[model samples]
Target: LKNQLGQLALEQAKTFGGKLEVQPKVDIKTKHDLSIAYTPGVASVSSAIAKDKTLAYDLTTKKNTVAVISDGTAVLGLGDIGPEAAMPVMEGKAALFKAFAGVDAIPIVLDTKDTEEIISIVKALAPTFGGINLEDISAPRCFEIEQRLIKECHIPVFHDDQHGTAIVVLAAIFNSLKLLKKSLDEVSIVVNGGGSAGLSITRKLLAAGATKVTVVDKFGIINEQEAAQLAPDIAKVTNREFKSGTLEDALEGADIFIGVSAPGVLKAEWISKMAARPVIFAMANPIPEIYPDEALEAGAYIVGTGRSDFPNQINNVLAFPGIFRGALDARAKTITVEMQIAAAKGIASLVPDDALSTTNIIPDAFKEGVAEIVAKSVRSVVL
Candidate 1:
C-alpha cells in the first residue's frame, strides 16, 4: 500500500506539474481591468503603503499571506535533502494553509543552510508576508534561527516544527488528562528526543503547569551534568531531579510518555513501567516510537501517534492553519506562548467531556469549525 501510494503521488505530481499557482481574484478580461489591477491604479496602492507602510495590510495580500520557509535541513522523515527536494513538502503546507483557513501561502526554500544567511534572507523578505512559518530546519540551529527571526522581524514568526507540534501535543494531553481525571500539576511526563519539537513540548508542558518533566535525548535523561550540553533554555527548567539514565529510566513511574524520537525506539515492556492509566504519545512520523496495539498491550491507557491510521493522531495540521489565520487576522506582531496555550485549550475543548476517550483526545484535522475555534482562541489572546 505504501509503495502504491508513493507511485500514485509521483504520477499525480508529474501530471499536475506542481501543487499550487497564483490565481487572480479579480477578473482581467479587458484592458481596462488590467490597467486598474496593475499599472496606473495599482500605483496608488503601492504609494499609499510606501507612505504609511501599515496600509499594505489593508491594500494588499499581506494580511492573509504567509511565507512557508524551509532550508531542507529536516524535511519530514528525510533529513537534509536540500531545497529542491523540500519543495513538495512546502507546497503541501501551502495547500493546507489555503484549504483550512482561506489563507494564501507561498513556499520559500532557501539554497543556503548558513544560519545567519537564512535569518537575514527571511528578515529581508518579512515585509511581503503577514506571518513566517519556519519549517524543516534542523535543531540547535532551528532554535537559534527562530529566536533571532522572531526578535528581529516586525511580522509574526513561528517555527511550526516546534510550536505547532507542541500546541497539538498539549491539546491531546489536555483531553487525555480530562478523560483520566488527572491534573497537569500532578502528572510526571517523560519526553524523549530533545530536538526542536521535544524542547518545545517540554517547555510548553511546563508552562501549562506540569511540574515533573524529564527530557531524554540520544544520551538519555538530561541530567544537570549533561543539561548544559543541550539547549540552555530547556536545561534550566527541565529534569529538575537530575535523573540519570536511559529513556527507560525516565519512563519508570512516569504518568505520560511523549516520543518525538526515532521510530521503534520505545519498547512495549517500558510502557509497563509507567504509572496507571498512562498516556503515551508516540509521535514519530510514518512509524511511531511504539505502535498503538503494542503500547496498549503493554498497559497504556491512552495512545496517540503521528499517523492518520491511528485513532488519536497528534497532527500539527490541527494547530498551524488556525494559528496563522488568527495571527494574520489580529495583525499580531508575534506568536506568543499565551496564544499557543489558548489554541491548545480551544482544541481540547472541541472534544467535550462526554466525547473524551482513549482514542479521541484530539479533534480530527478535518473537524468542522476546528480551525475557526483555534483562530478565535489565538486572536482573542493576541488582540
Candidate 2:
C-alpha cells in the first residue's frame, strides 16, 4: 500500500510535467497584449519599481509568494535523502500552502548543503519572495541557517520544522494548562533533547511566560556554571536551579516533562517521583519516551505524544500555513517572539471551556477555520 501511494504520485506527476506549472496573469492573444505585458507598455512599471523596490510586493508576486526551501537531510523517517529526492516533499508543501491558506509557495531544492553556500544563495534569492520557509535541514546546521537568513534577509525567514513544532507544542501546553486551571508562569518544565527541536521548544515556552525551564542533553541537565556542560551558551539564558543530573534525576518534582530525545529512557517509576498532577509529553517518534496510556496509569493528569494516533498529538502541521498567511497579509517585516506567543494562545483558544478536556486539550488538527484563527491570532500581534 505504501509503495502503491508512491507509484500513484509518480504517475500523476509524470503526465503533468511535475506537480505545478506557471500560468501568466496577463493574456497574450494579440500583439497589443504582448506589448502591454512584456514590451514598451511595461517599461514604466519596471522603472517605477527600480526607483522604489518595495513596489515589487504590489506589482509582482513577491507580496504573496514564499520560498519553501529544503536541504532534505532531516526528512522524517528518511534521513540524509539528497536535495533532488526532497523535491517532491517541497512541492507537496507548496500544495499545502495553497490548499490551506491560498498562499503562493514556491518549492526550491538546491544542490549544495554547505552552510555559507546555502546562506549566500538564499540571500540572493530573497528578492523573489515575501517570506522563506526553511524545511527538512539537519539540526545544529538548521539552527544556524535559519538565524543567519533571518539577520541577512529583509523578508521573514522561518524554519517550518523547528519553528512550527515549537509553536504547536507550546500551544498544546497552553491549552493543557487551561484545562488544569494552572498558570503558565508557575510550572517547572523539563525539556529533553538539546538539539534544535528541544531548544526551540524551550525558547517558546520561556517566551510564552513559563518561568522555570530545565533543558537536558546527552551530557545531563545543562548547567551554565560548568563550562563542560552542553549548551552553555543556551544555559546562560535559562538555567536557575537545575542542578547536575540525568533525565531520571531531572524528572524529580518537575511539573511537566517534554521529551524529544530517544524512547525507552523515561522509566514508568519515575512518573511517581514527579510533582502531583504533572503533565507529560513523550514526543520521541515511532516510540515515545513513555506511551500515553502508561503515563496515565502512572498518574499523569494530562499526556501528549508526537504520534497522531494518540490524543494531543502535538502536530506542527497546523502552524505553518496560518503563520505565513498572517505574515504575508500584514506585510510583517519580521516574525517576533510576541507573534509566536500570540499564535499559541490563539490555537489554545479554539477549544472552548465545554469542549476542553484532558485528552482533548489540542484542537482537531483538521478543524474548520483553524488556519484562519491562527492567521488572525498572528496578525493581531504584529498589525
Candidate 3:
C-alpha cells in the first residue's frame, strides 16, 4: 500500500510538470494598462518607494515576499547535493509558503559555500523581502549565518532547518505530555543527532523546562569528555550529566526518545527499555529512526514520525506556516523566544484538552484556522 501511494505521488508530480508558477494578480488588457503597469506609472510608484522605503511593501510584492535562501550544503539527508540539485526542495518550500501561509517566497540557492559570502548576499537582498527563511545550509555555518543575518537585517531571519523542526517537535511534546499526564520538568528526555535540528530542539526543550536531558552524537553521549571536543556554543547547556555512551545507552530510563538523526538508527528493542508511558518522536524524513508501529509495540505510549501518512506527524508544516505567517503579519522585528513559545502553545491548543490522545497530540496539517490563530497568539506577545 505504501509503495503504491509513493508511486502514485511520483507519477502525479511528473504529470504536473512542476510545483508553482507566477501569475499576475491584475489584468493587462490594453496598451494603456501596459503603460501604467510597466513603464510610466510604475516609475511614479518606484519614486515614492525611493523616498519612503517602507512604501516598497505597499507599492510592490515585498509585503509577502520571503527569501528562501540556502547554500545547499546540507540538503535534507542527501547532503551537499549542490545548489542546482537543491532547487526542487527550495521550490517545495516556496510552494508550502504559498499553500499554507499565503506568503510569496523565492528560493535563492547560493553557488558559493562561504559563510561570509552567504551573509553578505542575504544582507544585500534584505530590502527585497519582509522576512528571510534560511534552509538546507550546513551546520556551524548555518548557525553563524542565521545569527549574523538576524542581527544585520531588521526583518525576521529564520533557519527553518533548525528552529522550524525544533518548534514543531516542542509543540508535539507539549501536547504529548498532556496526553501522557507527564510534566516537562520531570521527564527524562533523550535526543539523538547532535547536528542543527537535534541540538536546537534540545536547547529549546531545556528552555521550556526539560531539565533531565541527554544528547548523543556520532561519537557517543555529549559528556564532559565529549564536551571538551565540541564548539563552545554546544558545550554550554548540553550533557549536564557526565553520562557517556551510545544513543541506546542514553535511552535507558528515559521518558522520551527523540530522533532527529538518520533513518533506522533506533531499534524497537531500545524503545522497550524506556520508562513507562514513554514518548518517541522519530523525526527523520521519508523514513524515521524507528517506525511508529515498532515503537508502539515496544510500549511507547505516544509516537510521532515526520511522515504525513501516519498519525501524529511531527512535520514542521504545522509550525513554520503559522510562525512565518505570524511574523509577517505582525511586522515583527525578530522572532523571539516568547513568540516561539506562543506558537507552540497555539499549536498545542488546537487539540482540545479533552480531545487529546496518544494517537492525536497534534492537529492535521490542513486544519482550518490553525495558522491565523497561531499568528494572532504570536502577535499578542510581540511587544
Candidate 4:
C-alpha cells in the first residue's frame, strides 16, 4: 500500500508540473483595471518604496512573502542531493506556509555551497522578502549561515531544521514533564546527537532552566573540556558534572532521553536504565533511535517520534508556519528565544489538561487554530 501510494504521488507530481504557482489576486477585466494594477498605478507604489524603503511593507507583497531557501547539501534523509534535487522539499515547505498561515512563500535552491556566497546572495535578495526560512542546509555551516543572516539582514531569519525541531521538542517536553509531575529544572536530560537539531534542543532546554544536559555525539559525551575546544558557549552551560562517556553510560539514571541521532542507536536496555517514568523523544526521521513501543516496554513514561504513524509526533511542521506568520505580522527584526519558548508553550496549551496523556503530550499538526494561537503567542514576545 505504501509503495502504491508513492507511485501515485509521483504520477500526480509529474502531471501537476509543480506544487505551486503565482496567481493574480487582483482582477484585470478592463484597460482601466490594467492601468491601475500595472504600469502607471504600480509606478507610484514602486516610487514610494524607493523613496522610503519601509513603505515597501505597506505598499507591496513584502509584508506577506517569505523565501524558503536551501543549498541542497542536506536535503531530507537523502544527504547532499544538490540544489535541483532540493527544489521539491522547498516547494513543499512554501505550500505549507501558504496553506497554514496565509503567507506567500517562494522556494529558492542555490547552486553554490560556499557560506560567504550564500550569505551575500540572501542579503541581496532580502528586500523582496519579509522573512527567510533556511531549509535543509547541513549543520556546522547551517549554524554559521543562519547567525550571519540574522545579524546582517533586518528581516527575521529562521532555520527550521534547528529551531523548528527545537520548538516542537520543547513543547512535547513541556507536556511530558507536566504528566510526570516533574520540574524542568530538576530533570537530567541526555541528548544523543550533537548536530544542528540536537545542539539547538540542548541550548534551548538549558536556557529554559534544565539544570543538567549531557550531549553525546559520535565521539561520546561532550564534556566541558571537549566543548571548550569545540562549542565554547555550549561548554559553559551543559554537562555541568563534566560527565564523559558513551550514550549508554549517559542514559544511566537520566530523567529524559532526547535522540536526534540515527535509528537503533538507543538499545532497549539503555532506556531501561533511566530514572523512573523517564520521557523519551527519539526523533530521527522515518526511523527513530528507539521505537515508541520498545521504549514504553522498556519503562518510558511517554514517547514521541518524528514519524506521523506514532502518537506525539514531534514534527517541525507544527512550528515554522506559525513562527514565520507571527514574525511577519509583528514585523519582528529577529526570531528570539523568548518567542520560541512562547510558541512551545502555546502548542502545549492546545491540549487541554483533560486531554494530556502519556501518548498525547503534543497536539496534532492539523489541530484547528493551532497556527493562529502559536502565532499570537509568538507575537506577544516579539518586542
TM-score of each: 0.86, 0.87, 0.81, 0.88
Off by over 4 Å in 3: 1-17, 76-79, 218-251, 254-270, 308-310, 353-383
Stretches of candidate 4 exceeding 4 Å from the true structure: 1-3, 225-234, 241-247, 353-383
**Model 2 over residues 290-339: C-alpha lDDT tens digits?**
88887788878777787877777777776777777777877777777767
Which candidate order results from sorting by TM-score in descending order?
4, 2, 1, 3
- Highest TM-score, which number? 4
lDDT (10s digit) by residue, model 3, range 1-383: 33545445656557876676888887688889888888777789889988998777687887878888887889977999899788778989999888777789898798999899889998999888888999999878988999898898889998887777567778788887776677988788878776766776776777778877777677666765543546734544455464554545555555455545778887787667788777778877777888888778888787777776777776667666777777877777778776776677667666655322433333455323445554555545426
For residue 197, model 1's alpha carbon misses the true position, in angstroms, by: 3.4
* Candidate 4 least-lDDT 10 residues: 354-363
Better of 1 and 3 by TM-score: 1
> Candidate 1: what lDDT?
0.78
285, model 4: CA deviation in Å? Answer: 3.0
Weakest 10 consecutive residues of candidate 3 by summed lDDT: 354-363
Look at candidate 4 and give me any clashing residue pairs: none
Candidate 2 vs candidate 3: which has greater TM-score?
Answer: 2
As a TM-score, model 2 comes out at: 0.87
The lDDT, on a scale of 0 to 1, for candidate 3 is: 0.74
Q: Which stretches of candidate 1 lie over 4 Å from their true place?
A: 1-3, 218-220, 223-247, 254-265, 353-383
Query: How far out, in Å, is residue 66 in model 3?
Result: 1.4
- Give one digit per residue, the lDDT tens place, for model 1 in 110-211: 999899999999999998899999999998799899999999999999998777767888888888887777788778788877675677777777888888
